[PDB]
């Protein structure tokens, strides 16, 4: 009885009262048959009938659906869309569904004002979900997203991010190491709902220096909320705190931020002894630029000796006063620099006072 | 004084929420009563006022629960007790009025007239 | 609730016989209370409550019409019994 | 036989081998729950304490278990100072594992010695050492006392603040350390100090591990100390909106669920509004499911009446739009948790404009029914159960729609 | 046996005397399982930190598999962050779900010793190894020993219980990597007790008189003493030095536990005497 589908659809579109239930049951029967693989060739006929009806009078049907009968329209649309999702066999009806959705959205954008996307919201959600095409560039998409970011279009940015994510999930390619920083800074500054997914994708199969990019972004951008995500990435993708770019790493740890102590504790309890010794020597080394924050540096020095791994077993909190057990040998000029730096930061006295 | 401010907030919320079904009223009063008891235990300087208002709200809840009894939905001659909880509700509420009037130390004429 | 309902039926027959056959003026009590509110939890209870209301509305009307000689009072009692037994 | 059964274990405890000694030590809870007589309980614990004080460092573990098993019987001990002396006399032993066992045992005795200053001091001392296997036990004992005493918690909270903000102690132990701040509910000043500590700790350690631990601990704190719940909820909502970590968002949901389950009425209107806005913004189905579960839980309780309290049409209210869209969203779970809120609002709040929402709901119900008709998956039947429960609630609350729903259900039969 | 006895410890109300009898039999015949450092680590905390962390971080961990970890691990030097990420999600798993990964970790512990790996990998592997120790020690010890033999027989459990010093015949690079020295000492302390039990059972078996018993006792005394002696030899610096501070501290803890366990070892190690360059260390360490 597929022939009467178009006629009942118009009767259903205007007023059905009961025929809507029969139509839904028929469609559910076809969906169940398809799930069982029982050659249920009825959905396509309903889809074609719906497309023909929409082409006949898009405005009248759109108005009736989005103003009078929202429930029935939403139910039918949901049933149809799940049918397409289940029937991944060649997605023949996919093009028809996309065209019908586009036409309905075009009609509704003008016909529906008081009923602001009561069901057009579901229609738009279905369109967005279905439009997850696979990008084929993966190199100019980054530039497109960067251009959009200056344009500041929310929907465009969301679509571009969604497309790029499928591109990254696709076969890996040679990612550029120049525009990636700009894209990440802009996606961070703007509210990027898919920022975490984009970062994970771009960092997993990346043809460039992930630690360098992350360090530069963290050091430069004063991004508040995502800073935690950046810190976790920095730690995990760089198992050693100071691995690739010691200059930038030390600039980050010590300076003339907000999350500094976490990184610093990780450095204290996750650094090879040679790396730590070299860090001590370079940090306490003579430097007239005051390139190391003396407070952080001195706290780190004081923590190094008391790292519990070193006293892990000797008798505790019962020491002989004269007996000095352990110290840290240092050099002449290094000692001079140490004393000079401690005195220099002591001379801050912004508010603390002489006492 | 966040504690005292919160106490006033809860009391005024209960005051305000009276235009709604008795079913919801019972639950609101129960939530706020256990709230007030918890706050009274937590603090010590508010232990008086907290418990005083708690007993008051409990009195009101008992009255409402008595009024919403199934007894009123059956004819007069069919009264058969074993369900008319209002019988004990009256004694409990009166005893609570006595308790609140006398046990607590600082009481004003306004509060006394409320209780009476 | 079922047991309470059976007790209510028994007490109903007692009240009917006492207020209709015995001194009716002594009883002189009006069924002035909320009645018939659809709060019952089972069709059985609903049907019993309907029967009770029918019996009360008959007996209140028939309180003073005749003398205690029980001219038609027997009819009211019999109809109440039949109704009470009707719901199985 | 009650006295005889004791000496039969006594001779075993007197046996030479740790085999029989261990067998005896782990045999007591049986005798206790067999004979709860206080005299016998006290006699038993005296010998347990002695064998603990002079033990092979495994009899001590067995006795620690006995204490952790028979806790209800502890209060009925007539002689406490002797017992506690025996147990505490092995905290000065130089063995870093014998200190850890004893700190655990003390932690297991907070119920009967909650004010002992010497025990408090010894725990606060062992809390800052170099032996991991004893620091990880001092943490436990400290968390145990911080619940059954106050003057101990006041000192601890300061100790912990300092000892977190010192760059010492590895992150692994810093994780174990934070939860102690649950039991700061003794006083309003304690709660305020702990909250002030949080506001800095979260920003100072924006990891994922630390955030996951801290937010849950202090939502528990806000639940316990019912004076700052309005403040806690808005912080949770801000982190729900902003932080991109999927894990942090999921914790936010699983925490707001607890707060909405304990104290629903306190939820203001703008709180629900912001939660609904966040639920709208997200593109992620799992997070949307989470927010909708929270909203369904709120809807049943009194919060809905406050939300629709006047001194903006209900149609203008965003909650309605979210409910309607999720009522038809593809996912079965989201659809179910949507229809829940719709049914709850329709049954509870009765405004003039909402009547169309009655039709909307009733018609969505058959869509859910047909969707779940033939799935035959555990989640499918869970959603179906929820849907039918919503149907029953709607019908009973409103007899008007009973005839409508019944005929549909029959047609799906 | 270890798994079941832990389960029984957990459930005590039901099993009336079975728990007591089982624990006696364990402690009497299998002393290399009743080592307090093993059972104490089970109690962890009551902080629920692990539980809450797991409940919210396991989710769907992109279906990590032993073969997946093996793939990443075969090229770990080329990519270390991949290994870090995999084991980081491994740590959260419960004591049971980890068993399928026993071979992957233990079998391939050689190249971990290679210079360059940040010690976080080693610390996490040590933690995982302890978790697995709390579940299945018997198999695990043999796997670890045969994986840490120098670069190759396949020692058996019965073999090691005869001559436990086989534990110390390991890659000399082990003596300068703290996290793995810990595991080696754990195995050594376990297998010395195991050897005691094995000899005690063997003599009773073969009895089908005192001379044999005090021969057993003398052998055990000398065996413990020799273990201590090689351990001190480890503490001695090698000429190349002319990390070691952490290694000496761990050996100090182990020696302390042995000394408390038995005095005669203290009286014997000293009557043998040991290189006196070590006195300034031990006198304070122990």
From Swiss-Prot, chain A:
It is linked to Neurodevelopmental disorder with cataracts, poor growth, and dysmorphic facies: An autosomal recessive neurodevelopmental disorder characterized by severe global developmental delay with motor impairment, cognitive delays, absent or severely limited speech, dysmorphic features, hypotonia and cataracts. The gene is INTS1. This is Integrator complex subunit 1. It comes from the Eukaryota. The modification Phosphoserine is found at residue 7. Component of the Integrator complex, composed of core subunits INTS1, INTS2, INTS3, INTS4, INTS5, INTS6, INTS7, INTS8, INTS9/RC74, INTS10, INTS11/CPSF3L, INTS12, INTS13, INTS14 and INTS15. The core complex associates with protein phosphatase 2A subunits PPP2CA and PPP2R1A, to form the Integrator-PP2A (INTAC) complex. Interacts with ESRRB, ESRRB is not a core component of the Integrator complex and this association is a bridge for the interaction with the multiprotein complex Integrator; attracts the transcriptional machinery. It comes from Homo sapiens. Component of the integrator complex, a multiprotein complex that terminates RNA polymerase II (Pol II) transcription in the promoter-proximal region of genes. Belongs to the Integrator subunit 1 family. It is found in: Nucleus; Nucleus membrane. The lineage of its organism: Eukaryota, Metazoa, Chordata, Craniata, Vertebrata.
Swiss-Prot record, chain B:
It comes from the Eukaryota. Belongs to the Integrator subunit 4 family. Component of the integrator complex, a multiprotein complex that terminates RNA polymerase II (Pol II) transcription in the promoter-proximal region of genes. It comes from Homo sapiens (Human). This is Integrator complex subunit 4. Component of the Integrator complex, composed of core subunits INTS1, INTS2, INTS3, INTS4, INTS5, INTS6, INTS7, INTS8, INTS9/RC74, INTS10, INTS11/CPSF3L, INTS12, INTS13, INTS14 and INTS15. The core complex associates with protein phosphatase 2A subunits PPP2CA and PPP2R1A, to form the Integrator-PP2A (INTAC) complex. INTS4 is part of the RNA endonuclease subcomplex, composed of INTS4, INTS9, INTS11 and inositol hexakisphosphate (InsP6). Interacts with BRAT1; interaction is required for the assembly of the RNA endonuclease subcomplex. It is found in: Nucleus; Cytoplasm.
From Swiss-Prot, chain D:
The modification Phosphoserine is found at residue 313. It comes from the Eukaryota. It is found in: Nucleus; Chromosome; Cytoplasm. Component of the Integrator complex, composed of core subunits INTS1, INTS2, INTS3, INTS4, INTS5, INTS6, INTS7, INTS8, INTS9/RC74, INTS10, INTS11/CPSF3L, INTS12, INTS13, INTS14 and INTS15. The core complex associates with protein phosphatase 2A subunits PPP2CA and PPP2R1A, to form the Integrator-PP2A (INTAC) complex. Interacts with NABP2. Belongs to the Integrator subunit 7 family. Component of the integrator complex, a multiprotein complex that terminates RNA polymerase II (Pol II) transcription in the promoter-proximal region of genes. This is Integrator complex subunit 7. It comes from Homo sapiens. The chain holds residues 21 to 438 of 962 of the full protein.
UniProtKB/Swiss-Prot annotation, chain E:
It is found in: Nucleus; Nucleus membrane; Cytoplasm. Coiled coil: none annotated. It comes from the Eukaryota. Belongs to the Integrator subunit 2 family. Component of the Integrator complex, composed of core subunits INTS1, INTS2, INTS3, INTS4, INTS5, INTS6, INTS7, INTS8, INTS9/RC74, INTS10, INTS11/CPSF3L, INTS12, INTS13, INTS14 and INTS15. The core complex associates with protein phosphatase 2A subunits PPP2CA and PPP2R1A, to form the Integrator-PP2A (INTAC) complex. Component of the integrator complex, a multiprotein complex that terminates RNA polymerase II (Pol II) transcription in the promoter-proximal region of genes. This is Integrator complex subunit 2. The lineage of its organism: Eukaryota, Metazoa, Chordata, Craniata, Vertebrata. The gene is INTS2.
């Amino acid at each position: 009885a597929r022939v009467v589908q178009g006629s009942p659809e118009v009767p259903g579109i205007t007023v059905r009262v009961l025929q809507a239930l029969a139509t839904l049951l028929s469609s559910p029967h076809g969906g169940a048959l398809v799930m069982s693989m029982h050659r249920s060739h009825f959905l396509a006929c309903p889809l074609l009938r719906q497309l023909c009806q929409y082409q006949r009078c898009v405005p009248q049907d759109t108005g009736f659906s989005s103003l009078f009968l929202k429930v029935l329209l939403q139910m039918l649309q949901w049933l149809d869309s799940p049918g397409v999702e289940g029937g991944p066999l060649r997605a023949q009806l996919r093009m028809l569904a996309s065209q019908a959705s586009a036409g309905r959205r075009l009609s509704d954008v003008r016909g529906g004002l008081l009923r602001l996307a009561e069901a057009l919201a579901f229609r738009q959600d279905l369109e967005v979900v279905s439009s997850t095409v696979r990008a084929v560039i993966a190199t100019l998409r980054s530039g497109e997203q960067c251009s959009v970011e200056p344009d500041l279009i929310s929907k465009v940015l969301q679509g571009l991010i969604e497309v790029r994510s499928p591109h990254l999930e696709e076969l890996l390619t040679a990612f550029f190491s120049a525009t990636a920083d700009a894209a990440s800074p802009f996606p961070a500054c703007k509210p990027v709902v898919v920022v975490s997914s984009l970062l994970l994708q771009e960092e997993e199969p990346l043809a460039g220096g992930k630690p360098g990019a992350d360090g530069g972004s963290l050091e430069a951008v004063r991004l508040g909320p995502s800073s935690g995500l950046l810190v976790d990435w920095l730690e995990m993708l760089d198992p050693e705190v100071v691995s690739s770019c010691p200059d930038l790493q030390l600039r980050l740890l010590f300076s003339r931020p907000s999350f500094r102590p976490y990184l610093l504790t990780l450095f204290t309890h996750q650094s090879s002894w040679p790396t730590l010794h070299q860090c001590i020597r370079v940090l306490l080394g003579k430097s007239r630029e005051q390139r190391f924050d003396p407070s952080a540096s001195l706290d780190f020095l004081w923590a190094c000796i008391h790292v519990p791994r070193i006293w892990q077993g000797r008798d505790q909190r019962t020491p002989q006063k004269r007996r000095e057990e352990l110290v840290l040998r240092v050099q002449g000029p290094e000692l001079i620099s140490l004393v000079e730096l401690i005195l220099a930061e002591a001379e801050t006295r912004s508010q603390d006072g002489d006492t | 004084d966040p504690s005292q401010q919160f106490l006033q907030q809860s009391l005024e919320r209960v005051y305000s929420l009276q235009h709604l079904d008795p079913q919801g009223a019972q639950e609101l009063l129960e939530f706020t009563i256990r709230d007030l008891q918890r706050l009274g235990e937590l603090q010590s300087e508010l232990a008086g006022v907290a418990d005083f208002s708690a007993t008051y709200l409990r009195c009101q809840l008992l009255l409402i629960k008595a009024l919403q009894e199934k007894l009123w939905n059956v004819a007069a001659p069919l009264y058969l007790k074993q369900s008319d909880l209002a019988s004990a509700a009256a004694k409990q509420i009166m005893e609570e009025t006595y308790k609140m009037e006398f046990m607590y130390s600082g009481v004003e004429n306004k509060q006394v007239v409320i209780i009476h | 609730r079922n047991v309470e309902l059976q007790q209510q039926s028994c007490l109903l027959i007692s009240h009917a016989i006492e207020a209709l056959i015995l001194d009716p003026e002594s009883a002189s009590f009006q069924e002035y209370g909320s009645t018939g509110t659809a709060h019952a939890d089972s069709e059985y209870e609903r049907r019993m409550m309907s029967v009770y209301n029918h019996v009360l509305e008959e007996v209140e009307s028939l309180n003073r019409k005749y003398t205690p000689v029980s001219y038609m009072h027997t009819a009211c009692l019999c109809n109440a019994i039949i109704a009470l037994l009707k719901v199985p | 036989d009650a006295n005889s059964a004791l000496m039969e274990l006594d001779k075993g405890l007197r046996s030479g081998k740790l085999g029989e000694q261990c067998e005896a030590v782990v045999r007591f809870p049986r005798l206790f729950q067999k004979y709860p007589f206080p005299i016998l309980i006290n006699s038993a614990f005296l010998k347990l304490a002695d064998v603990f004080r002079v033990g092979n460092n495994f009899l001590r573990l067995c006795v620690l278990k006995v204490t952790q098993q028979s806790e209800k019987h502890l209060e009925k001990i007539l002689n406490v100072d002797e017992f506690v002396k025996r147990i505490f006399s092995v905290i000065h032993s130089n063995d870093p594992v014998a200190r850890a066992i004893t700190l655990r045992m003390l932690g297991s005795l907070a119920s009967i010695i909650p004010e002992r200053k010497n025990a408090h001091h010894s725990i606060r001392q062992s809390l800052d050492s170099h032996d991991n296997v004893e620091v990880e036990a001092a943490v436990f004992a400290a968390a145990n006392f911080s619940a059954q005493s106050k003057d101990f918690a006041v000192g601890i909270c300061n100790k912990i603040s300092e000892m977190i903000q010192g760059l010492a102690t590895p992150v692994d132990l810093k994780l174990k350390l934070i939860p102690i701040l649950q039991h700061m509910h003794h006083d309003a000043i304690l709660a305020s100090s702990a909250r002030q500590l949080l506001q800095q700790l979260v920003t100072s350690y924006p990891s994922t591990k630390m955030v996951i631990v801290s937010l849950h601990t202090f939502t528990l704190l806000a639940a316990s100390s019912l004076v700052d719940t309005p403040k806690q909820i808005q912080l949770l909502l801000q982190y729900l909106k902003n932080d991109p970590r999927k894990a942090v968002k999921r914790l936010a949901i699983q925490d707001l669920k607890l707060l909405a389950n304990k104290t629903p009425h306190t939820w203001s209107r703008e709180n629900i509004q912001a939660l609904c806005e966040c639920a709208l913004q997200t593109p992620y189905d799992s997070l949307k499911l989470g927010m909708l579960s929270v909203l369904s839980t709120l809807s049943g309780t009194i919060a809905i009446k406050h939300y629709f309290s006047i001194v903006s049409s209900p149609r203008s209210s965003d909650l309605v739009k979210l409910a309607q869209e999720c009522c038809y969203h593809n996912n079965r779970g989201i659809a179910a948790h949507g229809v829940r809120v719709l049914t709850n609002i329709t049954v509870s709040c009765q405004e003039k404009d909402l009547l169309a929402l009655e039709q909307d709901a009733v018609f969505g119900l058959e869509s859910l029914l047909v969707l779940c008709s033939q799935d035959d998956s555990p989640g499918a039947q869970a959603t179906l159960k929820i849907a039918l429960n919503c149907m029953v609630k709607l019908a009973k609350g409103r007899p008007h729609l009973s005839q409508s729903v019944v005929e549909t259900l029959l047609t799906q039969l | 046996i270890k798994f079941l006895i832990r389960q029984a410890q957990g459930l005590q109300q039901e099993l009336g005397g079975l728990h007591s009898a089982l624990l006696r039999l364990l402690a009497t015949n299998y002393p290399h399982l009743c080592i307090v450092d093993d059972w104490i680590c089970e109690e962890e905390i009551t902080g629920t930190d692990a539980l809450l962390r797991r409940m919210l971080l396991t989710n769907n961990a992109k279906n990590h598999s032993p073969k997946q970890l093996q793939e990443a691990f075969s090229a770990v030097p080329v990519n270390n962050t991949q290994v870090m990420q995999i084991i980081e999600h491994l740590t959260l798993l419960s004591a049971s779900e980890l068993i399928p990964y026993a071979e992957v970790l233990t079998s391939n512990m050689s190249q971990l010793l290679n210079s360059g790996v940040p010690r976080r990998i080693l610390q996490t592997v040590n933690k995982l190894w302890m978790v697995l120790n709390t579940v299945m020690p018997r198999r695990l010890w043999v796997m670890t020993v045969n994986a840490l033999q120098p670069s190759q027989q396949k020692y058996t459990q019965n073999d090691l219980m005869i001559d436990p010093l086989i534990v110390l015949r390991c890659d000399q690079r082990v003596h300068r990597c703290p996290p793995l020295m810990d595991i080696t000492l754990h195995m050594l302390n376990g297998y010395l007790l195991a050897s005691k039990a094995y000899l005690s059972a063997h003599l009773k078996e073969t009895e089908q008189e005192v001379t044999r018993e005090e021969l057993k006792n003398a052998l055990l005394a000398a065996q413990d003493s020799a273990a201590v002696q090689i351990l001190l030899e480890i503490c001695l610096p090698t000429e190349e030095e002319k990390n070691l501070r952490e290694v000496q501290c761990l050996i100090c803890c182990l020696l302390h536990q042995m000394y408390i366990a038995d005095p005669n070892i203290a009286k014997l190690v000293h009557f043998q005497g040991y290189p006196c360059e070590l006195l300034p260390l031990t006198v304070a360490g122990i």
